[PDB]
């Protein structure tokens, strides 16, 4: 899809008005399937490890999030289509430069490839960036062909602040989602009863990320 039009005429107004934006059929079936195969190859070869939290304390991470993950830069062998996904995400964000709130987006995390391996795993209600670590936009791509949420669950429920309805996002094949990462969008992954895959990148606001890095580097 042409990035300029999609960014400026849809993603920008949707993000500013609602803080959440869904783009269905982002890359098309062939590319989505190739991504699914690359992800399943990562799973099958033991690459995933338990998802972790910003601040680890007495409780097991698995009491909080039951997913297993790996980080992808985009250039690894066997991850070329994930890299194309990431570049397509980046292209949309670059065409949004300066139009997403007051943020100035100069960078992002690596891609987090995540799997909830059925069995009722999920993620308790939480905020992606509650204390100002730099993350301003969460971008997620779903690649679950044949997902039937009424049976397998796995719905991402977002509680956008100040709204009269919450937002239920099925983890549908080839769906791209953006939302503000801060406290405006508490959210949860409801229990999944089938293997559920998603790829996430978080985009950074330059000034907030600089302050967060200064805090980390000074203790």
């Amino acid at each position: 899809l042409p990035a300029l039009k999609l960014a400026l005429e849809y993603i920008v107004p949707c993000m500013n008005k609602h803080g959440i934006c869904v783009v269905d059929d982002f890359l098309g079936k062939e590319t989505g399937q190739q991504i699914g195969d690359e992800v399943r190859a990562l799973h099958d070869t033991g690459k995933f490890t338990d998802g972790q939290l910003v601040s680890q304390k007495s409780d097991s991470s698995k009491d909080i999030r039951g997913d297993k993950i790996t980080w992808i830069e985009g250039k690894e062998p066997g991850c070329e289509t994930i890299g194309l996904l990431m570049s397509s995400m980046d292209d949309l964000i670059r065409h949004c430069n300066g139009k997403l709130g007051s943020y100035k987006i100069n960078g992002r995390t690596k891609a987090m490839v995540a799997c909830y391996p059925g069995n009722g795993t999920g993620y308790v209600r939480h905020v992606d960036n509650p204390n100002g670590d730099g993350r301003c936009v969460t971008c997620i791509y779903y690649l679950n062909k044949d997902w039937d949420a009424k049976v397998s669950g796995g719905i991402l429920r977002i509680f956008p602040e100040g709204k009269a309805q919450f937002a239920d996002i099925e983890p549908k094949f080839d769906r791209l989602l953006f939302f503000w990462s801060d406290r405006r969008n508490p959210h949860e992954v409801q229990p999944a009863y089938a293997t559920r895959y998603a790829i996430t990148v978080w985009y950074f606001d330059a000034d907030e990320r600089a302050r967060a890095k200064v805090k980390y580097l000074t203790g």
Binding site: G51, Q52, L53, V54, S55, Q56, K57, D59, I64, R65, E73, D90, I93, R94, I105, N106, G107, R108, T109, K110, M112, Y123, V124, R125, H126, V127, D128, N129, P130, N131, D133, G134, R135, R183, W202, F204, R209, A212, K213, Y216
Partner: peptide, 20 residues
Amino acid sequence: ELDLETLAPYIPMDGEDFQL
């Protein structure tokens, strides 16, 4: 109130971030 960072998904704080 609960420290929400104990529920937030980890990202690396060191190294670089990917620059756009």
